[model samples]
Target: RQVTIIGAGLAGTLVARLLARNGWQVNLFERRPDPRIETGARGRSINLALAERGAHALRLAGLEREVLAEAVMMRGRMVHVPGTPPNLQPYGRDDSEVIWSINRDRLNRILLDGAEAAGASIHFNLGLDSVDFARQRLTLSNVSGERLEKRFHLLIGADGCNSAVRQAMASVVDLGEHLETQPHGYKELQITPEASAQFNLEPNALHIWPHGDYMCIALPNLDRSFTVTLFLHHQSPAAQPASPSFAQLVDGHAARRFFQRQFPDLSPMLDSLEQDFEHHPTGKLATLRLTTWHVGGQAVLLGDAAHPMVPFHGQGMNCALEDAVALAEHLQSAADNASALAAFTAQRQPDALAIQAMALENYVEMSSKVASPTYLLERELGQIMAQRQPTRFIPRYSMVTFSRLPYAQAMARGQIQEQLLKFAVANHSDLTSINLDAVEHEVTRCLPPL
Candidate 1:
């Protein structure tokens, strides 16, 4: 019943809470100082897109209500297409189908509290320096550069992207790890609240500014401000129309001019655009693909350590949280540690790959397709078709966000539906011109009932 977890982040803390609550002895270690007490340097996205998968996982640990208390609801994408008042593209049928914008630091602290309350011993400022798998020993270092070794049989690596634990495993085993960095990089900016303390834009929507090869997105925060991100190609894409790249923009003034031209609508709202652009670091959009997640049950990795993806789909956190639930369940039900870790890996791998693919596809959809006339027509036709074939045609988004469907299944069905929508809308610009019965026949033949 004794287990150790490295990195007391979202996935690590939640899984620790689950195990400790079920009577397992769990010890969690984090490299950084306790976030609750320290005003940690912010680098990652301050706000996250919270959806049903994440909510379901939180409820399993009985902390959903508390987490949602500080979250803001986002019903749909408020697409800003320049010279216009932005278009609202609803994600689902109603409020219940909406996702949420949650602060990462806030959620991390809440999860830390949940883990401690469940009796998990959380050791902060202790980082895993190395591992001796043969001797079942781990070497850890403290903030002051003090190092110590501890005997551990069962270990979990929930450390994100550049996971030290994952690196330790890679040194001993060929996990076939492949890291893909997008041709693009992103920098975070800010949109503070108005002087009257009112929101500068619609507080309940996830605002997006689509500009073909690049885009800017803003998610609302509890402080009535927005976490704005500008995603662009590190170097100009030859195929795309002439557009500015990260390499082309040298300083804050360059960024300001870029925003004024590309994101004129959101430009006025970012009073500190120059300062924030200069201050915040540019982040890499890397997707981690691995052939294995565990090493003979002595240690296993979860969350970003196992599968890190781009922020485009906003499912990176949600997918990691789901990993927590599955890991806990397998450990609780399996006969031994090896069986539990093996089961956990086998079950989550396909889903991880599926979501990674979907996240990349969404980057294109959000940045380019969202404003396209054909995409709009197909979107409208997809909704009407969903109403016609409720049992068969759930939008890929609803399947992934609103329901607890497996990622692989959702991706599979979505591909089929994507083709069907194109088929129905092909050669027709208006929905009225298309035949409903013919489309229904095509849907029934190509897709199966849910």
Candidate 2:
């Protein structure tokens, strides 16, 4: 069987590798230059978090080990709030439950190499122009702006959130696409390697400076530096003196002054803060949802094309990788192309929607909830109950990040767990005030076997 993939990015190349290995003829088209030959920044470089779900999918495609080699381990969130010393709030029970921070361009190159080695043809510098669904052909524009047409019956749209294939599919049928953009925008800043070739901050942690409406996070790199990102609004009203947006800081001096006043502890360490603040582009964040993810058996969408969520939760890549694995399996096992596309959409849409919601919820947590007394109390009890309830009471973050659980199920259980945790800690100021025996009884009654 032969298949054509639009957008030879992470999802495109990854799915190509999987399908090619299954004996399918794979052709992937990319609008950009080959990552292996020319390296450049997109100006918005917020490194990805590779978790259990993503790692499992990569392992199936034999890329987990190689990927890990290029990633740096992050033990937990290194929370830095003014007036108090920094605290390491572990993501899970131990080091075994860590996530990896990896660069986007680097990972794409590795996936591109793997896909090529797996016998997939990757065509670079070609952008999708349009699709003729009736004739079952697609048109592309190359570097010289010349039009190229290919008669292909089957296509997979991995072209990302603004997918041309998806737009074309919508032209033929109603695939109900709804997108909600976030008010907050993000900008990337760097922490270069020290002259001593050592890390200035804690090497094994994801550092965060949460200040109510705004927050900044830093993830360590293999080069001993860190990739720091600040989440703020693109514009804010002048009436709101308490909340300052990115628009106010028009120059490097303004940014530096804001950083010094807002994030006093972190601004001084970053020497190039002025240039980075002024030069870097503001990153946009949004949540994309679809009523359907396929157009009959002729084409199907995966990764960002199907469901793009805000980067707060750091599960976009993992979800996309998972989609790739499921898609390959569904396409191969189904009786026909149409049925395969239908089945893939039905199976993944729920989990995709689930993760989208969770990612949005995490934005609030990352910004201010972690600094709250109520949230901390609930977290303290939740961690303790995880030990006592073990199988029945895994934390939501652990379920989503450290295990291969389905996102929808994880979300359902996480919803129930959050309420139960809040209730159990509602009357108590600390864990010592709560009765373990009664809490255990309530938990057993609430949560069944995994």
Candidate 3:
């Protein structure tokens, strides 16, 4: 049987590649021109920091090595606190290892090419205006404004947060879906290279300025520039005007005031500040949860179209890729397309919920905890324990960033570890004062073998 996939972004491309390689006739559709041939969407960060989870899925699909060649590994978060020198906090014991910062557009192009090479027929500039699940036909419009209808045995929705396929499927079935917006919205800003051609910040680390109420983060790009994002409250007076369009937000004086106060060192690099501000769209951040992901087993939703989580945990892309991998694997084992889609939804729904909760919790910690002395002290304590007992004590950040452990398992394990660390720290105020070596021995004795 043939499969029809919507959207040619990361999730869609990866799903197409997996299914096509398995000898399934797959037809992929994208709303935009081949990204390789066109200047793509703006206002979003051009680069993304991919972790072990995403890398693992890509490796399984045979695209990891090729994609890594274009990536820059960010060793850790470089916190830019005013008056204090920026500190590099390694994610794990290994100082050099880090999440790879890869260009989003480049990765999409690579996945698109890989899908085509695997014999997946991709129709670029083909937007789905409507879908008839009962008849198993999709009404599509191309870039040239021509409309046509095509029939398929199965449909997969990998479109972004607002998915037409999901909407169409919802019309015929009961898919309990809710969209919850966070207080914060985001706008993309760029820190270009110097005219003399020099890097601004440490290009190898993800730079973060964690202000109390809001935060700004920068991910390195392959073009020797950095894609910085400003996250602030949507209703804030300074950010409200740009809420409608991204460009209007950065063109004003508030944008300058923010950089001058929080990111003074890199302000000079943003020469096209006004244009960048006015051109980029202010994007909303939200979580989309659904009780069911499929209708009649003929159509199913995947990726952001199904589970859209905040980017705070850096798991949005990873989770979407994992969903694609899981669905593709299930499609291989199930006897019928209907059973395959049902099994895919059941398997991924729990994990998606766990990460959705964790991501929301992380947003608070990112914006507030980094500024707290108590939180910083605990982090220091956790680091000491991890260093002292490398095999036994794994910090929460390490488990999340350095391993391919499932999101639910990681969150559960991290809570236990956090409680143990807090207990030890409360009993002994300073690491030096406490017998850390002895404590390590006691801790390992109490816990089972790692």
Candidate 4:
């Protein structure tokens, strides 16, 4: 069987490698030039968080160690709140549970190399123009206006949130698609290495500056510099006096003042705050929801094209990579290709939506809840319960990030655990005063062992 994959990103490239290794002919098309040959445009270096799900997929393709060699392990969130000392909130019980911060381009280039080495054909500078489902043909074009058409046995759209294959599929089927734009957008900034070529901040944690209505985060880079992102409202200050938005900070002085007022300590680190704010484009954030993900056996959508969630949970890439693995498993077992596609959709949709909802909820938690006294107390209590119960009272973040549990099950169990924590901490100010007996009883009765 021959498969045609559009977009040579993390999802597309990995999918190509998987299919090629399974003895299927794979043709992958990418709009961007090969990163190995050319340094792409700047200001697009958004870092990715890789968890166990993505790691499993990479291991399947024999690229896990190669990718991790270039990644930085972040054990927890280093939250910096004004007027208080920075706190390291552990993501899991120990160092065994952690996420890796990796450069996007570096990972993509590695995946492309792996795909080509596995006998897959990669066409750079070629983009999808349209799809003819009836004819099983795809129309593609290059930057120089050259166009070509290819017929395939299977078509996969791992393009992106704005996928051409997805659009083509939507024209033929009712995808039940809906897009919700977040009121906020983000801009990327940098924290360069110190004069001694050392990290400016702690290298083992993901740094966060959480203001009530807005937030800024930084992830470590292999180069010792950090990738910083500022998330705020899209509206201008003149339009919304309640909170400052990206529009209000038009120039360097305004941005500097805003940073100085909100993040006094971080302000000094951002010497190029003005230039990054003015020159760096503000990226819009949105959640894309689709009711259906596949059309017969001809075409399917994966990754951002199928479900585009916010980055709060840092599961976007991980979830997409899992999708590719699941799809490959179903295709290998099913009697026919159409049956495989149908089964893939049925099995993955619930988990995809579950993660999508959790990602949105995490935005609020990261932005404001982390700084709240009540939230901190509850979190401490939850950790204690997780240690004691072990199986029944696992923290949602741990289940999502540390284990291979299905996302739907994790979200459901997380809600129950949150209710228990709120009830247990309702009157107590700290974990020492909480009613541990009552909490344990409720947890045992409500949640079964995983």
On lDDT, the candidate that comes out on top is: 1
Task: Output the worst ten-in-a-row residue range by lDDT, candidate 3.
Answer: 241-250
Query: What TM-score against the true fold does each predicted structure earn?
Result: 0.92, 0.92, 0.88, 0.92
Tens digit of per-residue lDDT, candidate 3, span 1-450? 689999998899999999999999999999987777755455244788898889999999999998899998898888887786687887665764579999898899889989999999998888999998777788999777788999988899999889999899888987887888887888787777552145347877888887766778888876677888887776645644543223334455767766675667656667766677667777889998999998866888888999988988888888889999999999998988889988998889888888898889888675443445556667787677777777667765666767777777777767777777676677555566766676677558654434
lDDT score, residue 268, model 1?
Answer: 80
Count: clashes, candidate 3: 7
What is candidate 2's lDDT per residue for 352-439, written digit by digit as tens?
9999998998875654434568778888888778888889998787789999999999998988888888788887886888887898
Which of candidates 1 and 3 reaches a greater lDDT?
A: 1
Clashes of 1: 0
TM-score for candidate 2: 0.92
- Best first by lDDT, ranked: 1, 2, 4, 3
User: What's model 2's overall lDDT?
Assistant: 0.87
lDDT of each: 0.88, 0.87, 0.80, 0.86
Query: What is the alpha-carbon lDDT for the whole of candidate 1?
Result: 0.88
Q: Residue 151 of candidate 4: its Cα lDDT?
A: 87
lDDT (tens digit, per residue) of candidate 4 on 1-450: 888899999889998998888988999989988888854455347678899988988998899999999999998988888666677787777778888998898899899999999999999999899999898888999898888988888888999989999999999999999898888898888877672143247887889887877989988778777788988988955554867887788887899999999888888888688998888889988999998888998888999988988888889999988988888788778888889888999898999999999889887664443457888898888777788899899878878988889899999999888888888888877677777888888889999999
lDDT of each residue in 206-319, candidate 1, tens digit only: 988878878888888887878888888888777753667888788889888988887877778888888887887788898889998999979999999999999888898999
RMSD of each: 2.7, 2.6, 3.7, 2.7
Instruction: Tell me the lDDT of candidate 3.
Output: 0.80
